[PDB]
Write a protein that binds this ligand. Structure first.
Ligand SMILES: O=C1NCCc2[nH]c(-c3ccnc(-c4cnc5ccccc5c4)c3)cc21
Ligand SMILES: O=C1NCCc2[nH]c(-c3ccnc(-c4cnc5ccccc5c4)c3)cc21
Ligand SMILES: O=C1NCCc2[nH]c(-c3ccnc(-c4cnc5ccccc5c4)c3)cc21
Ligand SMILES: O=C1NCCc2[nH]c(-c3ccnc(-c4cnc5ccccc5c4)c3)cc21
Lengths: 285, 284, 290, 283
């Protein structure tokens, strides 16, 4: 019997409990994230500021639901305050000072196929949890993937529920148990894009003729970066980047794929990612 | 960085915390106001009783938002209780035992043009705050303006949000930033009517009244108005324009020299004080 | 920086510029195609006659857009004229006197038809569909009659014609479904390509006649085979490609990019030279081809 | 009897006639502006690229109509081409290499009240023309006001019809909402910056939005202590929050400060320096 507690929204002023600096820690889809300190404990936290409305209510509601998952940024507290005579949802979440995923990769001098498999598996776990509770994230990108600390055993966590949406006898088919459109399969594409970048350092879709190469599904595995990468992985990427949403692999199929399943039986082959990523600081702004 | 706390609705029975008398302190647009006492502190407060629904919810919501302003009656607590098996919003607000604005004026024996200016400025300040946070009051009248105490330095406060309504790159015109009808300019009219009564003791508008209002037929008759500067008459004339869009905005009003420099306004005495008691009859 | 010129509709009488014969060169979905000659140059061209309306305007518009592609019949000029007191779009296009695709196949004996050549043909049909899809146009009528050769000379280019059914189909991490709706218009060309590929390898269609209201059900069921003796030489790789274009569920069907990347199309010149029965089965079956 | 020719859209490829560089000359509301060169004449021009649709058709249409006015950027040619298999309106316009209005002001070391009057008059004239032919511009901002050359006698020109809209006793001759009066506000904002170097409505961000709807601004010293009460009164009247209280363009062109530009005091303003001294919060 597992129940977890529901969301108690605090109504007292947030400045009673926290010291709010104005150091920006990130730009969210609807409001920026600031660095704040626990007044009593001195410890550091992140504050996202949203203006109260049905949209912001849903973000909080959906994020709270997924907050239990180990690979999703944990919500510490939610405040409802008045700011310049308007209502406000203020979300306090744990501090992910390990920085973005591709910043950590970019800081070495090498990255291996087996580590890429381990990263992908933990992103997968987050998506898997979300989907299993009928939430599509709809905005899985490089900027939303942060580490808890700089210490080498930090956990990778997913952030930002600004685009998240809800997706809704005993031999009965999955279609007959509630409608459900393509919301979910759209995370599966992101997973493919991220996997591609993780293995070579650049996106599969490049520099108005980009928009058509995406709908056509025109990309490659060019050398020298991809010449070591096993055909097994190329085949998995090919299957996540299918232009037709229903041809795309589901998250359960993905977590069961042997390349993800047995992360520790994947070849230790080195990739170019680490260098290609810093060598291309320009067109990454 | 200023945040103020949001509204925490108390769910426990109000009678746990307050002794509720049935002495009526006023009749609100939707429910009367009763005198109550803080059980623990003995101190006196006012309780407004509303039946829960979308209308009442909005009154509380809007009033809470404006409650920060010094010139608007402060909400102490909001209770949600069951009363005769129906849901209830009960609002506890500070006790304004200084009485109504025109009751205080009516009790001397004289009132000056400078004091009228100081009164108008504090009412102005209330409207200015409301408008700046996009709320129109829509019911600014004599009964809704009360004083905190009888002590001569009491603050004047605005009450009753029963009619209040919400009114909705960086060089773009005010019309292109959200629609907005005449909700606000309707306060500006009340301001004119109150200013008029403050300066002479009677209203500018006396079934043929209904047409004198839409026509804009009123005067500044003697002897009351013969002392009153042309500058003030001109301000009143501009608040009482029948065409809403011709009317002065609250920012223009607060910037008007007669309001701006209250203390540079002539000390000339008005008839208000006497005309007001001398006319107790047609004020019921 | 590649811009191409837009369409200038000529308003003067077409008969100022061309001699119009009434030799029919083909029947289009909405109006026949006639043989015409450039008055000044003596050279031969084809004229398609459409009656002006939103439908005909779209045909011209879409065809013009696709006209750039090397494997789509080139539009030379468009006239807007009055014919019997009604408005008219007259389209002048290059002359494809090499004839239909299956007419050329049907005319050999001397060096038979090979699997490698079928691969080269399929690749050039694919290139036309690929271009169309990439500019968001579905052709929706890719059949044998719409595939013609520029000349009889053995190095002639194969070209696709007839836009009478053509229809328009509408940061860096965004899914293809979130960039505009789009139904099954395109995947429907992919089926044609499968049917054409099948005929190209054996000389008959995968879906038959007889009963013949029972052909309609064998199509929706997906009942067809690779019978012998024709298919016994054909590699399993090709059969697998056809199986995948002829899927009855449109979404299961291969996209044009996957098709152009398939090794059998990609490396046309690495495809076995194995001879097919197509050439003979095609003339041997002149009857039920009318 | 004055007729002017209508718009002939060229259908041939634009690269037949022009060499198209990819040096960006500005960012428009719907598509950027590029530097291009006349292949035969060698002369320089600006190319705005729009994707064909009803929106773009209207921009071209309305811009062409206003292109006659001396204070509106002149359209040279309009091409309709295929670009990556989609239709395109390409607009070729005269090259305004004098730069933006506030860049020219920012480059001296002084600006006078009389010159601000002359600038405001020429902006006024463009608006006046537009309004008289029933077109509201709806996007009169600093970035849309450019000079023809660097030469000190260059003409100031208004650009970008991406927001322009057609606007159809004076009330009984056709409806018409507040489209026009919204240009009148822009004129006030521009005039305000022209006289002191900063906008009337500040940064400090969500409380700016309310200061605009409230109409809270000032004429603070030291910048405004020299500026005549007559001008402050004109600005006050263009910045009225109520659109119908706002001055019309005809009243504006007839105001003595605009009418007699050359009878306006030569008093120097701080604009020139306040503008470079504040390069930061202007990005
Ligand atoms: O929801 C969001 N919107 C988009 C970006 C974002 N970052 C965060 C976030 C949350 C917790 N911690 C951080 C954070 C803390 N410290 C950092 C140090 C150095 C780099 C990045 C950091 C991010 C960011 C939340 C969101
Ligand atoms: O919201 C309202 N609607 C209209 C009636 C009203 N009275 C009040 C009010 C609020 C606080 N104090 C009082 C009050 C207290 N003591 C008094 C003594 C004598 C006369 C009037 C008094 C009013 C009235 C609020 C409202
Ligand atoms: O749009 C169309 N509708 C379907 C039939 C068709 N044929 C053509 C066409 C176009 C250009 N040339 C020809 C043509 C020319 N010369 C020929 C000589 C001998 C046989 C066939 C020929 C076809 C046909 C266009 C269309
Ligand atoms: O319609 C528009 N949208 C907003 C930006 C813009 N710039 C232009 C434009 C038009 C003509 N010339 C220029 C131009 C040319 N050369 C320049 C050199 C240096 C600075 C600015 C320049 C502007 C810009 C048009 C538009």
């Amino acid at each position: 019997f597992h129940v977890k507690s529901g969301l108690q929204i605090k109504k007292n002023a947030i400045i009673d409990d926290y010291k709010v600096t104005s150091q920006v820690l990130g730009l969210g889809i609807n409001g920026k994230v600031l660095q704040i300190f626990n007044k009593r404990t001195q410890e550091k936290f992140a504050l996202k500021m949203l203006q109260d409305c049905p949209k912001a209510r849903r973000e909080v509601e959906l994020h709270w639901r997924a907050s239990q998952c180990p690979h999703i940024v944990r919500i510490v507290d939610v405040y409802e305050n008045l700011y310049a005579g308007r209502k406000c949802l203020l979300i306090v979440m744990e501090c992910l000072d390990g920085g973005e995923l591709f910043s950590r990769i970019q800081d070495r001098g090498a990255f291996t196929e087996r580590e890429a498999s381990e990263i992908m598996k933990s992103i997968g776990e987050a998506i898997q949890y979300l989907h299993s509770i009928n939430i599509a994230h709809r905005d899985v990108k490089p900027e939303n993937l942060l580490y808890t600390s700089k210490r080498p055993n930090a956990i990778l966590k997913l952030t930002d529920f600004g685009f998240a949406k809800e997706t809704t006898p005993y031999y009965v088919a999955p279609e007959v148990l509630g409608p459900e459109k393509y919301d979910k399969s759209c995370d599966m594409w992101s997973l493919g894009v991220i996997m591609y970048i993780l293995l070579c350092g650049y996106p599969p879709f490049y520099s108005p003729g980009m928009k058509t190469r995406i709908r056509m599904g025109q990309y490659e595995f060019p050398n020298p970066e991809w010449s070591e990468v096993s055909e097994e992985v190329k085949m998995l990427i090919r299957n996540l980047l299918k232009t037709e949403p229903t041809q795309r692999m589901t998250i359960t199929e993905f977590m069961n794929h042997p390349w993800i399943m047995q992360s520790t039986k994947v070849p230790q082959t080195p990739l170019h990612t680490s260098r290609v990523l810093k060598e291309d600081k320009e067109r990454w702004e």
